[PDB]
Amino acid sequence: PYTIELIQPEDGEAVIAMLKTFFFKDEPLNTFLDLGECKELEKYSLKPLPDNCSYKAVNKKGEIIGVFLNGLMRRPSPDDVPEKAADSCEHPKFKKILSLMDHVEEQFNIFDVYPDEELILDGKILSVDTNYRGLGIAGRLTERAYEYMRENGINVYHVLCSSHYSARVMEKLGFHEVFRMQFADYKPQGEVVFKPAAPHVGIQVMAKEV
Ligand SMILES: CC(C)(COP(=O)(O)OP(=O)(O)OC[C@H]1O[C@@H](n2cnc3c(N)ncnc32)[C@H](O)[C@@H]1OP(=O)(O)O)[C@@H](O)C(=O)NCCC(=O)NCCS
Numbered sequence: 001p002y003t004i005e006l007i008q009p010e011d012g013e014a015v016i017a018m019l020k021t022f023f024f025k026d027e028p029l030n031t032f033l034d035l036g037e038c039k040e041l042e043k044y045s046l047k048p049l050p051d052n053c054s055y056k057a058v059n060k061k062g063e064i065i066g067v068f069l070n071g072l073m074r075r076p077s078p079d080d081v082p083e084k085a086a087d088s089c090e091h092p093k094f095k096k097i098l099s100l101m102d103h104v105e106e107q108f109n110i111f112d113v114y115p116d117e118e119l120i121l122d123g124k125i126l127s128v129d130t131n132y133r134g135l136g137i138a139g140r141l142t143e144r145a146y147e148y149m150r151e152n153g154i155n156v157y158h159v160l161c162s163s164h165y166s167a168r169v170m171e172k173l174g175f176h177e178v179f180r181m182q183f184a185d186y187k188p189q190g191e192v193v194f195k196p197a198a199p200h201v202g203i204q205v206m207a208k209e210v
């Protein structure tokens with residue numbers, strides 16, 4: 001028995017404590033790199049919260065057992081100056097992750113897929129406590145966002161998935177792939193950076209039109 005609730009500003013520390021226990025250690029790229037202490041990822045995770053569309057799953061004792069942190073993304077302005085997230089990151093391991101994200105955005109712009117959309121919901125951080133996995137919590141977190149989308153006239157939910165394993169979860173929820181890149185093909189300086197286990201395959205950007 002659990003609730004799905006809007007994450008409030010007072011929840012920041014608890015959200016970070018939960019992510020440090022799970023996501024920081026068990027998201028596939030983080031585990032592959034052994035991310036360790038990473039204040040930059042704490043900062044990254046806290047950033048979308050004031051957009052008021054991030055959700056927590058909370059058990060009957062009041063403990064956070066899952067989160068889906070979402071932020072609004074806006075179509076780049078006609079005079080946009082594209083910036084690399086990796087350029088402002090001092091943590092070498094997290095820099096590799098941000099560089100991968102920058103590379104994906106350089107190759108694929110979600111706003112090209114949906115020329116009429118000005119605002120798209122971006123699912124940034126999805127994590128569920130191990131003891132509560134396989135119960136559909138990811139789905140219930142995701143579907144709470146549909147409510148926000150309806151309330152605000154947002155049609156598209158965009159979610160970068162870091163493994164085929166998590167892309168499959170989004171597929172079950174009615175998302176479809178819009179871009180993919182194998183880890184074996186990600187060679188920004190001529191060499192492979194990420195070599196996690198074979199079943200992960202690579203990143204898949206997933207989207208749903210709600
Ligand atoms: C991805 C993640 C959020 C899924 O959350 P979830 O609430 O367990 O999602 P689901 O209940 O839909 O379970 C997904 C699948 O995990 C498998 N599963 C079943 N029981 C499980 C358990 N005890 N533990 C782990 N996985 C289990 C099943 O294949 C299940 O699919 P199915 O129920 O449709 O057969 C979770 O695995 C997680 O936190 N992973 C690590 C962080 C991460 O990679 N986040 C996503 C980055 S894009």
Ligand SMILES: CC(=O)NCCc1ccc(O)c(O)c1
Nearest residue numbers: 029030097123124125126160
């Ligand atoms: C929807 C989601 O949780 N995508 C994960 C993307 C991501 C974010 C932060 C990381 O440190 C990382 O390795 C991967």
